[PDB]
Amino acid sequence: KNVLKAWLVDNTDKIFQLETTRSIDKEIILDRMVAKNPGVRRETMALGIELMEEVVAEALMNGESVNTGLFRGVAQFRGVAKQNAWDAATNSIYVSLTQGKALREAIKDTRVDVLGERPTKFYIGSGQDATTRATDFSATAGRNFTLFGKNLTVAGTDPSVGVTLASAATGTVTKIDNDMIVLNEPSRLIILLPASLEDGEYMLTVTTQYRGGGGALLKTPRSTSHTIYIGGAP
Amino acid sequence: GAKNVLKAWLVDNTDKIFQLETTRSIDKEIILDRMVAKNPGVRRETMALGIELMEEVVAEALMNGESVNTGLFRGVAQFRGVAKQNAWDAATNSIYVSLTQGKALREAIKDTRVDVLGERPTKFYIGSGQDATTRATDFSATAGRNFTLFGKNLTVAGTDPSVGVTLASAATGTVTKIDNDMIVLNEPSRLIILLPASLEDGEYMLTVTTQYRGGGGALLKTPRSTSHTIYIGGAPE
């Protein structure tokens, strides 16, 4: 019933990479809930989701493990316990989440549509968040994020050249200052993510005139993207 | 000050780490009861229907390759294993959903203080854990697969028939004893176990019962027990 579209990318080994499609938030979830069951009042459903989030946040922050159909969560601690004390600069709380029974059951009814390899050797293969060590394209605002790929060097004179973040919620495009691209290699980019960015999903785009391998710069810039979740600055 | 409090122990990792003192485990039934308790304006049956409806929409969105964000989490489908002959192989490749905390949890973390209790009173406890399949260290585990327990004086030893590793279901209270031969590594600071495949998804209380005495010494006349909560995810396909 369900279909996941996947690219073949270099790991070296070949690995599957989910195709860039869509991001959905609470507003779209509420629209789809009302479309599936027109007997539910949107305002009641919106209230219910906020209420449930309050209950779960409070449970996790008061040391309970929480299990829903979608996930299981528990509060965790990050950083070394320096001098048998909590240091707000090195230590932090986070909630570790694992897929729940409803997701494991939905996976059973899902097939993978292999798209093959991308037609051009220009893409974002993988990523890593410095702070959380996550590789699922979740990231931390005001901290470093590494992009691994092919022919990613930010180069050229054209004004569109550079790294951008486009908000899935508002559509607003934030350009990353070129000084904040602290490593600019064809197979790897290290960027500092702006601290002011609101939590949510963004479209990360590398636009460059850098030609694959050696040679002259491309006359017109080319773009490659990947979805990314940015969690607010710690 | 901070409206939430987390209690944490200082356990061994040459250096020390923080270990949450877990309060209890809650499911959809308790969540729904607490929602009604906070807002008597809502009808519990309407809230229960809404949660099933929200889960269906989120599960369909994820399984059709969309990234999903709520205030509690962001999710996206991910793939495991190498591409053999540039084609999906159901016997070596798998799908999972990677989940990260959302904005509501990040804001709640801001109103939370950590109350350090110091070091654990006894030198017999479960400090940390690791799932072999996912490599998760949050005490989430995979049924039919290996799990590692790190701690102090965890060696399973003694003549008493109660000695061993058990899992008690939070949903029913049903206890599953792991066969002693499914204890693959039996060291004081680390146990490697094979989890049975038939375990239903959910939270369990994992208990290590043993007559093994701290460091050097004769076996204890009476067995002692130490526990840790564990989430078990259903066996892989």
Query: What CATH number is given to the structural domain containing B80?
Result: 4.10.520.10
Q: Is B92 on the interface with A (CB under 8 A)?
A: no
Query: Kind of pairing, strands B4-12 and B112-119?
Result: parallel
* Interface touch A98/B101, C-beta < 8 Å: no
* Closest residue of chain B to A98, computed from CA coordinates: B99
* Interface touch B112/A93, C-beta < 8 Å: yes
C-alpha–C-alpha distance, residues A66 and A15, integer Å = 33
- The domain in which residue B102 lies consists of 23-110
What CATH number is attached to the domain comprising A148? 2.70.50.70
* Interface touch B67/A23, C-beta < 8 Å: yes
Alpha helices by DSSP H, listed for chain A, are 26-36, 42-60, 101-108
DSSP, residue by residue, A84-150: GS--TTT-EEEEEEEE-HHHHHHHHTEEEEEEEE-SSS-EEEEEEETTT---SSEEETTSEEEEEEE
Nearest Cα to Cα of residue B105 among A98, A95, A229: A95
Q: Is residue B118 located within the same domain as residue B83?
A: no
Last residue of a domain, one of B81, B110, B139: B110
Which positions in chain B touch A55 (Cβ < 8 Å)? Answer: 31, 34-35, 38
Q: Is B205 on the interface with A (CB under 8 A)?
A: no
Residue found under tokens 């636009």: A207
Q: Is residue A49 located within the same domain as residue A86?
A: yes
Q: Is residue A43 located within the same domain as residue A152?
A: no
Token pair belonging to B140: 């989430």
Last residue of a domain, one of A49, A76, A108: A108
* Residues A144, A192 contacting (CB under 8 angstroms): yes
Q: Is residue B122 located within the same domain as residue B100?
A: no
C-alpha–C-alpha distance, residues B23 and B229, integer Å = 10
- The angstrom resolution of this structure is 2.2
Which positions in chain A touch B46 (Cβ < 8 Å)? Answer: 40, 44, 48
Amino acid at site A14 = K
Token pair belonging to A223: 């773009």
Q: Is residue A187 located within the same domain as residue A143?
A: yes
Which of A29, A91, A138 has its CB closest to that of B74? A138
How far from A117 is each of A2, A5, A70, A166, B86, CA to CA, in Å? 22, 12, 32, 26, 9
Nearest Cα to Cα of residue B11 among B150, B149, B109, B165: B150
Residue found under tokens 């008493």: B160
Which positions in chain B touch A104 (Cβ < 8 Å)? Answer: 201, 233-234
* Interface touch B95/A110, C-beta < 8 Å: yes
| Upper half-sphere CA count for residue B79 (Cβ side, 13 Å) | 30
Q: Is A212 on the interface with B (CB under 8 A)?
A: no
Provide the number of structural domains found in chain A: 2
Q: Is residue A64 located within the same domain as residue A179?
A: no
Which positions in chain B touch A98 (Cβ < 8 Å)? Answer: 99, 134, 136, 138, 140, 231, 233
Sign of the CA dihedral with B85 first, then B87, B90, and B92 last: positive
Residue found under tokens 């007997």: A39
C-alpha–C-alpha distance, residues A119 and A19, integer Å = 13
B168 has which bridge partners?
B175, B205
* Residues B199, B167 contacting (CB under 8 angstroms): yes
C-alpha–C-alpha distance, residues B236 and B145, integer Å = 9
How far from A79 is each of A75, A85, A127, B189, CA to CA, in Å? 14, 11, 22, 21
Q: Is residue B47 located within the same domain as residue B105?
A: yes
Q: Is residue B122 located within the same domain as residue B202?
A: yes
Residue found under tokens 């409206």: B3
Nearest Cα to Cα of residue B138 among B126, B146, B130: B130
Amino acid at site B144 = G
Which of A61, A85, A200 has its CB closest to that of B116? A85
How far from B108 is each of A56, A159, B30, B179, CA to CA, in Å? 10, 41, 20, 42
Q: Tell me the longest C-alpha to C-alpha distance in chain A.
A: 62
How far from B111 is each of A25, A52, A58, A159, B156, CA to CA, in Å? 24, 18, 10, 43, 41
Which of B51, B67, B136 has its CB closest to that of A52? B51
Interface of B with A in 169-188 (CB under 8 A): 170
Q: Is residue A117 located within the same domain as residue A97?
A: no
Which positions in chain B touch A85 (Cβ < 8 Å)? Answer: 116
Q: Is residue A171 located within the same domain as residue A205?
A: yes
* Residues B75, B67 contacting (CB under 8 angstroms): yes
Residue A127 to chain B, least CA–CA distance (Å): 13
Method used to determine the 3D structure: X-ray
Q: Is residue B129 located within the same domain as residue B197?
A: yes
Nearest Cα to Cα of residue B179 among B191, B168, B163, B190: B163
Alpha helices by DSSP H, listed for B18-176, are 28-38, 44-62, 103-110
Mutate which of B11, B42, B54 to test chain A, going by most A C-beta atoms within 10 A? B54
Q: Is residue B79 located within the same domain as residue B193?
A: no
Last residue of a domain, one of A108, A141, A174: A108
Which positions in chain B touch A133 (Cβ < 8 Å)? Answer: none
Reading across the β-sheet that carries B25-26, which strands appear in turn?
Answer: A92-99, A71-78, A65-67, B25-26
